[PDB]
């Protein structure tokens, strides 16, 4: 079985090496397709750097909004992730209340 299989596979291997150069072309095309998936990602990247490497402002705000959106879909998430005591300060009366809400101070952020 493996003898006829091997010989037919060698002939099919010649024709399939021709088709493998064809595959190199097709896979350069898939190269472009995934290049571009993550290059829409990368357009986001290039501009987000140029607008945030100055100072991470939408990155400050998007840690905040990604914490908000992470919460937001933690809702549907059964995950036994948590938070803990004392930053969103709901020690609503506290110095830490003016060290989580006044933590918004730049330099502390």
């Amino acid at each position: 079985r493996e003898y006829t299989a091997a010989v037919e596979a060698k002939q099919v291997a010649q024709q399939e090496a021709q088709r493998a150069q064809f595959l190199v072309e097709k896979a350069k095309q898939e190269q472009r397709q995934k290049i571009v998936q993550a290059e829409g990602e990368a357009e986001a990247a290039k501009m987000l750097g140029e607008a945030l490497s100055k100072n991470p402002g939408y990155i400050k705000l998007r840690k905040i909004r990604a914490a908000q959106n992470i919460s937001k879909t933690i809702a549907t998430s059964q995950n036994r992730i948590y938070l803990t005591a004392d930053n969103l300060v709901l020690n609503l009366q506290d110095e830490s209340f003016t060290r989580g809400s006044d933590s918004l101070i730049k330099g502390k952020k």
Binding site: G40, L48, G57, I64, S71, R80
Partner: protein, 96 residues
């Protein structure tokens, strides 16, 4: 019988090759249009980024509030809510 099935699989691969030709073209097109759909959503991002690099987080304060109402209704569904500490040596046991 299995010879016909093997030939059918080979033909399926060839049809995937044709589909990948037309994915070549689709790839040209979303070159253009995915770069620039990025450009759109992402320039919402450009200006929010600059506005905040200058001052600091303005819109998810107000939208901690607004998106609290709306999507933190979509979080008033979130069964387990607690609220983290930091800046200290915080140490934890958590839900099973």
């Amino acid at each position: 019988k299995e010879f016909t099935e093997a030939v059918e699989a080979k033909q399926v691969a060839q049809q995937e090759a044709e589909r990948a030709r037309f994915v070549v073209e689709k790839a040209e097109q979303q070159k253009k249009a995915a770069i620039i759909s990025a450009e759109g959503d992402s320039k919402a991002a450009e200006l929010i980024a600059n506005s905040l690099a200058t001052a600091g987080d303005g819109l998810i304060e107000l939208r901690k509030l607004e998106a609290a109402e709306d999507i933190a209704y979509q979080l008033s569904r979130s069964r387990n809510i607690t609220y983290l500490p930091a800046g200290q040596s915080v140490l934890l046991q958590l839900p099973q």
